[PDB]
Amino acid sequence: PHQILDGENCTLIDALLGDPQCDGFQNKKWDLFVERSKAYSNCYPYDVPDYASLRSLVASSGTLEFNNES
């Protein structure tokens, strides 16, 4: 009934940013992003100043569709 998007060792912020091990989530819509406890990062280290706020904002948006701008 709900469009479930699996974690597959990916976080929502990593899929937002474009992790090379998370490139399969590009332009993907969901109704529930199920994050896994085995998730990690394999890119440049980063530190979001408001991580919970950004994560809740993207989860409430519920889409990863991205339009390139020149």
Partner 1 sequence: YAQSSGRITVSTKRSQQAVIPNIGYRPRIRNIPSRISIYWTIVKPGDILLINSTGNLIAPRGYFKIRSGK
Ligand X SMILES: *[C@@H]1O[C@H](CO)[C@@H](O)[C@H](O)[C@H]1NC(C)=O
Least distance (Å) between residue 22 CB and ligand X: 10
Among 6, 28, 42, 56, binds partner 1 (CB under 8 A): 42
The whole-angstrom separation of Cα 10 and Cα 42 is 10
Q: Which does 1 bind (CB under 5 to 8 A by kind): ligand X, partner 1, none?
A: none
The whole-angstrom separation of Cα 31 and Cα 20 is 23
Least distance (Å) between residue 8 CB and ligand X: 4
DSSP 47: -
- What's phi and psi for 48, nearest 5 deg? -70, 125
Write out the residues near partner 1 by the rule CB under 8 A: 13, 16-17, 31, 42, 44-49, 54, 57-58, 60-69
